[PDB]
Amino acid sequence: PAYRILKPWWDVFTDYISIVMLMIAVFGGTLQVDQDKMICLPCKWVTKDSCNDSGPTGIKYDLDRHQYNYVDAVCYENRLHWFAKYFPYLVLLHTLIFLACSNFWFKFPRTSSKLEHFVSILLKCFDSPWTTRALSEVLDKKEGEQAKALFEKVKKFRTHVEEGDIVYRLYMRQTIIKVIKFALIICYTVYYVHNIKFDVDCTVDIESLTGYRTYRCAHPLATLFKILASFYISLVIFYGLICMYTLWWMLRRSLKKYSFESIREESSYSDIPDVKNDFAFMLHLIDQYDPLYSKRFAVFLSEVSENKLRQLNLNN
Amino acid sequence: PAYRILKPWWDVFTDYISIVMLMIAVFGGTLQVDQDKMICLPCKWVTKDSCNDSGPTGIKYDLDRHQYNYVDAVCYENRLHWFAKYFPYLVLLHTLIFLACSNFWFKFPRTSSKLEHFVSILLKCFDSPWTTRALSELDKKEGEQAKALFEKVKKFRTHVEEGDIVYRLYMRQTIIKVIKFALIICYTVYYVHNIKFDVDCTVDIESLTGYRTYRCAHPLATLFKILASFYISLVIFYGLICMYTLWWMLRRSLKKYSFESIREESSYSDIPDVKNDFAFMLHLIDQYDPLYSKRFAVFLSEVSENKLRQLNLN
Amino acid sequence: PAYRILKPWWDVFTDYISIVMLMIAVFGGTLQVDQDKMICLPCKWVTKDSCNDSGPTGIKYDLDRHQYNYVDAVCYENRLHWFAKYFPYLVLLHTLIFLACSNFWFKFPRTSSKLEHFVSILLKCFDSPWTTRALSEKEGEQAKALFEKVKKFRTHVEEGDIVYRLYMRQTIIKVIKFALIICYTVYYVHNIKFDVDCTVDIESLTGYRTYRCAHPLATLFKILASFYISLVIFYGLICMYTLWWMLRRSLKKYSFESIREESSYSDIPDVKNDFAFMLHLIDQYDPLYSKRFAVFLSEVSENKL
Amino acid sequence: YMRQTIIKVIKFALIICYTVYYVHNIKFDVDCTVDIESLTGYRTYRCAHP
Amino acid sequence: MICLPCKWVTKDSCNDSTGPTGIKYDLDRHQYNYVDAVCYENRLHWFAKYFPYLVLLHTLIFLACSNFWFKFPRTSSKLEHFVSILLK
Amino acid sequence: AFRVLKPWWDVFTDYLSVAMLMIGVFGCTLQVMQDKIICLPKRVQTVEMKGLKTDLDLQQYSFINQMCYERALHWYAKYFPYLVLIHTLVFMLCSNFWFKFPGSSSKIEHFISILGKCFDSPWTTRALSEVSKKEGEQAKALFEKVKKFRLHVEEGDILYAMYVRQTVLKVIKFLIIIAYNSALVSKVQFTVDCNVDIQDMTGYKNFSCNHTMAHLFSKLSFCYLCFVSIYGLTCLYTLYWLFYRSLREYSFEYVRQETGIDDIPDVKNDFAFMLHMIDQYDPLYSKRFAVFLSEVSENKLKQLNLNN
Secondary structure (H helix, E strand, O other), X not given: OOOHHHOOHHHHHHHHHHHHHHHHHHHHHHHHHHHOOOEEEEOOOEOOOOEOOOOOOOOOOOOOHHHHHHHHHHHHHHOOOHHHHHHHHHHHHHHHHXXXXXXXXXXXXXXXXXXXXXHHHHHHHHHOHHHXXXXXXXXXXXXXXXXXXXXXXXXXXXXXXXXXXXXXXXXXXXXXXXXXXXXXXXXXXXXHHHHOOOEEEEEOOOOOOOOOOEEEEEOOOOHHHHHHHHHHHHHHHHHXXXXXXXXXXXXXXXXOEEOOHXXXXXXOOOOOXXXXXHHHHHHHHHHHHOHHHXXXXXXXXXHHHHHHHXXXXXXX | OHHHHHOOHHHHHHHHHHHHHHHHHHHXXXXXXXXXXXXXXXXXXXXXXXXXXXXXXXXXXXXXXXXXXHHHHHHHHHOOOHHHHHHHHHHHHHHHHHHHHHHOOOOOXXXXXXXXXXXXXXXXXXXXXXXXXXXXXXXXXXXXXHHHHHHHHHHHHHHHHOOOHHHHHHHHHHHHHHHHHHHHHHHHHHHHHHOOOXXXXXXXXXXXXXXXXXEEEOOOOHHHHHHHHHHHHHHHHHHHHHHHHHHHHHHOOOOEEOOHHHHHHOOOOOOOOEEOHHHHHHHHHHHHOHHHHHHHHHHXXXXXXXXXXHHHHO | OOOHHHOOHHHHHHHHHHHHHHHHHHHHHHHHHHHOOOEEEEOOOEOOOOEOOOOOOOOOOOOOHHHHHHHHHHHHHHOOOHHHHHHHHHHHHHHHHHHHHHHHHHHOHHHHHHHHHHHHHHHHHHOOOHHHHHHHOOHHHHHHHHHHHHHHHHHHHOOOOHHHHHHHHHHHHHHHHHHHHHHHHHXXXXXXXXXXXXXXXXXXXXXXXXXXXXXXXXXXXXXXXHHHHHHHHHHHHHHHHHHHHHOOOOOOEEOOHHHHHHOOOOOOOOEXXXXXXHXXXXXXXXXXXXXXXXXXXXXXXXXXX | OHHHHHHHHHHHHHHHHHHHHOHHHOOOEEEEEOOOOXXXXXXXXXXXXX | OEEEXXXXXXXXXXXXXXXXXXXXXXXXXXXXXXXXHHHHHHOOOHHXXXXXXXXXXXXXXXXHHHOHHHHOHHHHHHHHHHHHHHHO | OOOOXXXXXXXXXXXXXXXXXXXXXXXXXXXXXXXXXXXXXXXXXXXXXXOOOOOOOHHHHHHHHHHHHHHOOOHHHHHHHHHHHHHHHHHHHHHOHHHHOHHHHHHHHHHHHHHHHHHHOHHHHHHHHHHOOXXXXXXXXXXXXXXXXXXXXXXXXXXXXXXXHHHHHHHHHHHHHHHHHHHHOOOOOOEEEEOOOOHHHHOOOOEEEEEOOHHHHHHHHHHHXXXXXXXXXXXXXXXXXXXXXXXXXXXXXXXXXXXXXXXXXXXXXXHHHHHHHHHHHOHHHHXXXXXXOOHHHHHHHHHHHHHX
């Protein structure tokens, strides 16, 4: 939206991945809700409560349809592993937590106000005509007054955001939480992904109600729950890799100090001082999306440009 | 929306918690509508109207499919705790009550009008060029807008300070939310353990079926228990947030707003002491962003009026 | 929309009750569509055309599955009370009529145009800044044109009271409909029962005369019915209060005595008919708007201008 | 635009030919002789298409 | 496709030859489902099986033909420019 | 909007990919609810015909059904819609590879900006009519913008090369899809034979099954195959257009024939490639920009500006 300038390539890639795992969640939830059953057949010949496995005639189990449904429910609830039953719900919960960690920067009001103000002033500077005029380096008097006003807003916003570092701390915290969560998901999922099996033997001791002790069930949506899980795992890995890169981007450069050395050398105004803390991190994110926004906003931050605009308005 | 500035972190966190609770309520409701039943098998051997439960061959109960359906329906109606049946409707009703209690602020016409007109003044003061000039320390059109907004600010100060309806409404909403959280927690924590998989029903339909006692498997029992635990955790978070909000209101008098810090930091040292309902709204906008209050408060000084009138003439 | 100013607390809060009645109507209608059936089992022991009710082994009825389905359909059609079958549709019908009665105020083109013009010029007069100097006691041309528009609208609206009578009729319809709904729902709520005794005389096709049926969505419907009653009761109370309010004082005679006494402009005359009732609704929503608009209704304010 | 109109009119001609030729084959009662006697026990079945 | 076998057959054709009693076919539910599937695949005409898909395909072709020049860029440029200059 | 730089083949492949995604969604919905297999045991146990009694319950029948669905059915018949969805998502993501690159998109935006500016510039038509004030100042500014674009874009070599990579990737993916689909399209069949060993559970070991949605999946597979074939002919013709004529060099000899000016330097590399793109879109833009590319035209414009 209007906040896309603060969303780098890794952020939008994580958003796309989380959308795909949400699709996984909704698909698995629909499958589990509608067509997840467990057809269990009694083992007629059992050796020590283990299926012996010893024209042809069909085997008569003498069980009603309702007894079969009871056996299916009991061996689905007591012997099928919890991962196979609750994989889509866990996927949905993890996807929701990932989205919440992505948007906790987006919704938390203390940093949200700073983001709104920064985006508003960046968009005003992008559409300001005197910004283009200074980038090109005779004006409207009201336009010059508004330009001096936006200069004052830049200075007061600097004083507003340079005093604190909650924005950078928040972003680092959500990155760390996402990395830790991805590690946990990968570990427990690679542990339990082999528990999703087609043929499951169940021993539930309902011989008083059905007449049989051990049964063999075949879970229908097992293999399709298998590959999905595996493919789900793949997406998570990519997510983690992206997150790990962000963690590397946390420590490769100190985001609390973002220098203007490249900007002032290429431009005529070789006087600008560096920014710090939340302003520095936000300008780093701006450079991640497009350095042109930061270079254009640089002409509204310098004092030589302030003197030039004062002299121009004296002429204007 | 327009009232986003009036929603602090606690309000937005409760809003997302309510959205999640509504989502799980709809999930449980659809689950109970479609897949909720109980598979009931009669106990062939009985001991004093109970379940004796004394190659293998299957037990022939000699019951039709419709006798089994009748047994399922009768045992579902009679012997199954009301929590396990109406839990999705309970969470749906509680979530709707919480959402209505949270959004009654913006729907009651008196308070809704007060908040909306306050939001308009705050927005146009944030976008007011004379706010900018006062912060730094003039076109005739901008001066006219500045004088109009100054008059609107003082007439609003007169109009809202007379009665604290918004503060009382917010306090009552928070109190209701805390009480609802407490009641939900005690009754839900008490009644979660009645959601069991296996339930024995002695419903006395021997004249129609031939058996007296039956053993039922409730398929949506562990799922309902997991949803109940998730709902309990969400209500724990909601209640802790609401308790913090109540503590925030009660620790300090929100009906008084000392402008000493802003009048000391900023140039204008004549800033009046905002009191009662206006004090409550200014505390809310402080909880959102102190910059909004700092850039709106420049219109409350009578010194700035004298500078504005002088610069209007000049 | 733009009519939020013309929606007092009774209008908005009953609209919320109207939107929550519709939810239980759709929820009930989905229930009636999906799994509203009756599991009917024959009574082998029958005495005086009723069920005698006189290890263990199951009772063989020697009935096919299709005979059971036919018995279910016949007893659901003949021996289930019509309230149990058609409660959600009745709730949906009542809710739709309530919505139509509460929105036909804004949908009827005469009242729609009148309310739209009043709202538009009230908003554009609220945007006017000269009311500040008025209440303190190119911009001048704009104030004069708005004064002329207000006067020429007043000369058009004060002639008739179509809006007031239509609002009275709508509120009276709402309260009488509430009375009928609560009466018949209290009468027929007890007919929703889980267990019922059907006697349809299909012995030729089935072999049994009397059957004992179980209705699954009865108790749910029962509590839904109770919920509906609660909502209706609340609705009626608000409507009752509305009646009292619209019979408390002459809503067709708006007196500006307080505003003209507070402000210097005491020449403000008494408003009549639709303009008076609409200003009363404005006072109900916000007394600020009526006081702020009253200065352009005064001709000595034009003398100041 | 001329090519689009020509394609649409020839498509209409083809549709209104083949659809009206094969529209009578949608019957309720259909007899099937599928030769599955080794699995079911019968050879000819009189099906009804609802 | 609800399929019922013909008890009395005469050269691959049903013969069609005190209360009445239902005919016992000695077929399971699954044998009935198998017969349904086989006869549905083999004997029911392809038009009755692919009528909605054929209709959808024809509508897609018709809609593509009607809206081809709006999406074809060589004519879309001319159409958009003509629209802009005509309204302006 | 970059749809101007999008030629007809790109948008054709876009709607083909949308149709492919619709086919995949429809197949997935079929697989979710209507996909079922029906298995009957083999060798069970005016004439009268009596049905063969298998002595099997409904649950044994369902167990046989899903035991033969998991094993006997080919993996293609079970996972065709999911493969279609995956392949069409990869196609859609790859369709705008040349569009989503940051530096490439910056170059494209710059090029469409200068071309639209010179198209809107009256001096282009004025000089075209002449050969065959304030606006002169704007023309000189646009001409120095032309020189800046020449110094900024023409020396690079990323655009044509990466477009060639995208086309090659599309052609290779098309070839793989067609090969595997033609190899495994005979596996989707109505009647199958299932030989699972569940003799200890159902008494039988050999079953004859029918896949009820095999005919519809075969029709969907042929429809997706023909769509992929059309996509592949589109990408093959794109490869032919990329490789047959060198887009490293754009000859302005047609403008030299039309416009009397002859000192027009031929553009090179990405300038030539993008002018080929816009010539495929609208050659009028290219022949009108060519007079704004000549430095002799710049000298004449300088002379007229000095005269004014």
